From a paper:
Siderophore-binding proteins from two thermophilic bacteria, Geobacillus stearothermophilus and Parageobacillus thermoglucosidasius, were identified from a search of sequence databases, cloned and overexpressed. The siderophore binding sites sit between the two domains.
The structures of the complexes of Gst with azotochelin and 5-LICAM were solved using the apo protein as a search model. In the complex with azotochelin there was a single protein complex in the asymmetric unit, with density from Glu25 to Lys300, while the crystals of the complex with 5-LICAM contained two independent complexes both with density for residues Glu24–Lys300. The ligand structures superimpose closely on the apo model, with r.m.s.d.s over 273 equivalent Cα atoms of 0.61 Å for the azotochelin complex and 0.48 Å for the 5-LICAM complex. As expected, the Fe atom of the ligand in both Gst complexes is bound by the four catecholate O atoms and the conserved His218 and Tyr279. Several of the loop regions on the surface of the protein have high B values and show high flexibility in all three structures, with some variation between the three. However, the regions around the siderophore site are well ordered. The solvent tolerance of Gst is slightly lower than that of Pth, with an approximately fivefold increase in K d observed at 20% DMF.
Numbering used by the authors: 24 to 300
The structure:
Amino acid sequence: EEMTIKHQLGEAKVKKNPEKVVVFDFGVLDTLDKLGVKVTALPQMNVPKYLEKYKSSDYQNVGSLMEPDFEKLSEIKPDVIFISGRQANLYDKLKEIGPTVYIGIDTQHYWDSFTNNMKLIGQMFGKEKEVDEELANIEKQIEEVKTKAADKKALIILTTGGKVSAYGKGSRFGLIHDVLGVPAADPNLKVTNPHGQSVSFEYIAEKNPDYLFVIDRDAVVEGKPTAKQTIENALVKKTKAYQNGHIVYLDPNYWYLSGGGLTSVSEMIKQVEEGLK
Ligand SMILES: O=C(NCCCCCNC(=O)c1cccc(O)c1O)c1cccc(O)c1O
Ligand SMILES: [Fe+3]
C-alpha cells in the first residue's frame, strides 16, 4: 500500500494508486494517457501536439517545464510528482511539496531503463498486464526496424538558432544507434549533453552519412520550423543523405518535448522505420 521507489535522485515513498498525480515528463504523461490513468496537473505552457487534450482546463496548470508553479503545487498537495532531466535541479523543492520520482531514461541503458520506468508505472497504478502487452508490441517494432537498419550509416543532428548540434551512441537520441540498430556515421561521438555537441556544417559534410536524422528544436521551443531552412547549406548538399533524399525530419513534439513513454517510444520507432524505408 506504500511503495518505496529507488530512483536516480533518491528514494520516494508513494502510496499505491496515488490520487493526485502531477506530471512534468511528457513521456510519462503519454504513458498514463495510454493506460487510462487520471492526471491532476502538468505544466501547460508547452504541451506536445499529440498530447494537446492535456491543455484542457480540466487539468491544473503547474507552470512550465523549467519553472514549476510551486504555489499551485502547494495548493494541490500531490500524492506523486513525476520529473525528468529538465527538473532535476529542482528535486529538493518539489520533494518538499510532495513525493517526487525522477523518471528520466538512463540513455547508457535505454531499453532496460525504459522497461523499468514503464514497469514501475504499471505497479503504481495496477496496470502491469497492459504495460507488458505494450512493451511486447514495442519489442516487435524494434526487431522489425533492426532488419531495415543494416548498413545505413546515420548522423543525428538537432537544429536550433540556425545552428547544428550532433548526437551519437549513449546520448539523448542514442537509441537510434543503440536500440534500433542504425550504424553511426561518427562512432567516436561521445555526447552526454541535453542539447548535443556543437559542430560545423563542414563536420556534417566530412562525415558524409547515408542518412541524416534531424530534430527541429526551434519548432517546439520557439514555435517556428527552422530545420529545413537550416539544412539549406552548401556543404550539407554534398552528402549522400542530401543527394538520395534521405534527410529524415523527426517530429520534435515526440523526440524533443517528450520521449520515453509507451506512445512516444512507439511513434519514435515508426518515424525511424518510415524514414529508412
Ligand atoms: O536542463 C535542461 N535545460 C537547461 C537549459 C535550458 C536552456 C533554455 N531552454 C529552453 O528555453 C527550453 C524550453 C522548452 C524546452 C526545452 O527543452 C528547452 O531547452 C534540459 C534537460 C534535459 C532536456 C532538455 O531539453 C533540457 O533543456
Ligand atoms: Fe531543452
